[PDB]
Design a protein around this ligand. Structure first.
Ligand code: VDI
Lengths: 300, 237
């Protein structure tokens, strides 16, 4: 198990760690989070009590270094930093534990939710969508726009997802216009799977990472990306059986975990009705369709 | 992507534009089979592609053989239309390629966009007005060349005959839409209006009779009367 200590909490803020969250009061004696399961990526995220504007947060993997949070009063936000002095960092963590000023990552031993949401997500890939190579962790926030959004203004703070566009040359082979637009299997399997992502795990990892930034930060561009990647699979007549079965599992837990209060802004009615009821793969997402119908029959 | 009458003038400016109508591309007769079921038999169709400024009509004849062994023909027709239109653009010299293409049905926006990916600066937009272009088959010479075709064929017409020597494109297109609207609402009576006076003939290189300006006014009035009537007949008013 690993630890993310906090120097202090000078401003009142709701802190998120994966799907968990707890309130911290202005100058409450909070010094971090402990017992973080090794082997997964994680996200620690923040919404200031005074300015709900800008949810923001950090993707990290504790295997990749010793990381702490420090509030920065000039820039006005909780900043992730890396501590390179290993002896110094064990020292800091042990004292905060001894003084028990740390919350415990509250995993229920029966619960596989986080694994089920981050199965294919890998820090090495996150750091290519979120380019800031001097840091081992990755910052994201509500307002960050995607590469495709900037194409339609600062590229240093962009989210570099794979551009998917169903009415592009990349998606449509000359001479196969009608074919490739109505059955996107070419675009899925040759262009994206074989060409760009190399395998389905990297595809699902971007898919999951897009979902998670949409939910935790209300990042609109990430939401657009998540829906696009689902629609490409669902609009492909020819998909590996194993991809269909995993996709149903991926989406089921994403639907399962989504706050009900957010369902009206994060779920695109058109895409989901198409995928679940009109697409080639309409019959191939049994789990996902059963929970969508039982939880959000209004969208459909 | 449909605008309002506001700019009926954008039509007749100097930006090259074409109207694409696909109504008559896929055409069938419906009939009973010996076993008492229903079957369709396809007949020749056409794409109606018109420059509203010049009156040039690029009438792409669609032969019944294009459907042979194809499924989902009504959906295929929209893609066949988009393919033919794209081929037409590619066959024109650059300086004659349209800056924008106006589809008269919203179902053509995506087939055409996809076929025109190579022409990003050609704007594709649909109407939300009501244009009578489906009545182009009521024009005898046009109907005749479609039905006689034995193979795919492109036939070029000027749908305004020589009117532009005497009137503006704006007026020329208002006359054409009034003639087509009339033909669509009551073909028999519309055709009666146009030919009742045998002293006014149709030149071999024209589609419509050689009316004087005076006679066009009278004709246009009779077509308006016709449409207003049929509106009465229909709605009881
Ligand atoms: O408003 C419409 O629908 C009409 C139109 C179409 C295209 C342009 Cl560029 C301008 C006017 C008017 C005839 C169809």
């Amino acid at each position: 198990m690993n630890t993310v200590p906090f120097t202090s909490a000078p401003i009142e803020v709701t802190i998120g760690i994966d799907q968990y969250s707890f309130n911290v009061k202005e100058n409450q004696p909070f010094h971090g989070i402990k017992d973080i399961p090794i082997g997964h990526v994680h996200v620690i995220h923040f919404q200031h009590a005074d300015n709900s504007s800008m949810r923001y947060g950090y993707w990290f993997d504790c295997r990749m270094g010793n990381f702490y949070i420090q509030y920065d009063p000039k820039d006005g936000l909780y900043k992730m930093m890396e501590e390179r002095d290993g002896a110094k960092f064990e020292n800091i963590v042990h004292n905060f534990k001894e003084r028990q000023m740390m919350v415990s990552y509250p995993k229920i031993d029966e619960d596989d939710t986080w694994y089920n949401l981050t199965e294919f997500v890998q820090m090495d890939k996150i750091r290519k969508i979120v380019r800031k190579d001097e840091n081992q962790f990755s910052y994201v926030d509500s307002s960050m726009t995607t590469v495709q959004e900037n194409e339609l203004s600062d590229p240093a703070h962009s989210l570099n997802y794979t551009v998917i566009n169903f009415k592009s040359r990349e998606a449509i082979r000359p001479g196969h216009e009608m074919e490739d637009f109505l059955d996107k299997s070419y675009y899925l399997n040759t262009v994206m799977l074989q060409g760009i992502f190399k395998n389905s795990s990297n595809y699902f990892g971007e898919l999951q990472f897009a979902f998670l930034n949409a939910m935790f930060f209300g990042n609109y561009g990430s939401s657009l990306q998540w829906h696009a990647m689902i629609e490409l699979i669902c609009s492909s007549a020819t998909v590996p059986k194993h991809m269909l079965d995993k996709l149903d599992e991926i989406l089921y837990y994403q639907i399962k975990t989504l706050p009900e209060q957010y369902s009206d802004i994060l779920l695109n009615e058109r895409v989901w009705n198409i995928c679940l009821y009109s697409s080639f793969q309409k019959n191939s997402l049994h789990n996902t369709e059963k929970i969508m119908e039982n939880k959000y029959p209004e969208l459909l | 992507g449909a605008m309002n009458s506001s700019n009926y003038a954008e039509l007749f400016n100097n930006d090259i534009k074409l109207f694409v109508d696909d109504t008559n591309v896929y055409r069938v007769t419906v009939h009973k089979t010996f076993e008492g079921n229903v079957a369709t038999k396809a007949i020749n169709g056409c794409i109606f592609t018109l420059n509203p400024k010049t009156g040039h009509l690029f009438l792409k004849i669609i032969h019944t053989s294009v459907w042979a062994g194809q499924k989902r023909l009504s959906q295929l027709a929209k893609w066949k239309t988009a393919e033919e239109v794209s081929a037409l653009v590619r066959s024109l010299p650059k300086e004659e390629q349209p800056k924008q293409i106006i589809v008269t049905r919203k179902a053509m926006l995506d087939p055409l966009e996809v076929h025109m990916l190579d022409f990003p600066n050609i704007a594709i937009r649909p109407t939300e007005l009501r244009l009578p272009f489906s009545a182009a088959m009521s024009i005898d010479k046009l109907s005749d060349v479609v039905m006689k075709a034995t193979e795919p064929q492109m036939v070029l017409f000027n749908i305004y005959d020589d009117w532009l020597d005497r009137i503006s494109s704006y007026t020329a297109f208002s006359r054409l839409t009034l003639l087509l609207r009339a033909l669509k609402t009551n073909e028999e009576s519309a055709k009666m209006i146009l030919l009742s006076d045998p002293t006014i003939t149709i030149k071999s290189y024209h589609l419509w009779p050689s009316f004087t300006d005076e006679q066009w006014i009278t004709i246009e009035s009779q077509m308006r009367d016709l449409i207003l009537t049929e509106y009465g007949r229909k709605y009881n008013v």
